[PDB]
Amino acid sequence: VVPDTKPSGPQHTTKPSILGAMEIGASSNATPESTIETRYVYNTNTNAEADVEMFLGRSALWGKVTLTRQYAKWEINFQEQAHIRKKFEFFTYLRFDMEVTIVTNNKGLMQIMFVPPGIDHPETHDDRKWDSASNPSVFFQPKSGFPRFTIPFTGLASAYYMFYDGYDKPKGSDNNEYGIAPTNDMGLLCFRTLDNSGGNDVKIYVKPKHITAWVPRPPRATQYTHKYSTNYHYKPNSSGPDEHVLKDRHFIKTRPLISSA
């Protein structure tokens, strides 16, 4: 819980608990007992809804796909949906198992093949690569059930890189890849339908659990432009004769006059 408020009478002190220093890079400890006359207040609120586990552990949407010919593919990443990508880009390193739930409006009999990294996925339905011996697969009938399965932390390091300030190839190389793109791939999910019944919309809800965030950061203050790319200059009109005009798309509203708001 949060601490209670202590009483505070009139104080005439020579050590001001108000005059701090912003330059020292430390925040002030000034509680309202230092500025005014407080009363004892049994305060029992908790920030239990703010800890990383309950903050991120809510099973948001990570990606949508569309079964074209009873087949669709999705490479696991949080980079497509800005709302959850921002909550992740709060922190630098994150370590979490994830719990994938598939909300599909299809009807019939579907199959999900979690392709671990480094192998070839089925390039279409009724491919030979679907008969797999070791690639873990999930069968389900969308009516009567939502398929769900946990992927443990597949990291190749002690955490996930939300931001990576490095490359993967040495200096003189030519196809160097900035960012977190090479640092990790979580495989991919290949969906197919064995029947013909339902729609084609598949939503992948992923819930980070057993989270352990590592380095806080300034939350993203600009709308994204690409994935894995942390650009923010939006090039809105590529066709017209202004393509070289780059919007900014921030969220700082302006007020008409200071000292009047």
Partner: peptide, 25 residues
């Protein structure tokens, strides 16, 4: 507190602010 899948990664959700706000020597 039962774990029905007999595995750690299958469990549900698990459970000092001076590292920031005072990182002085």
């Amino acid at each position: 507190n039962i774990n029905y899948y007999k595995d750690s990664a299958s469990s549900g959700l698990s459970r000092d602010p001076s590292k920031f706000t005072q990182p002085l020597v």
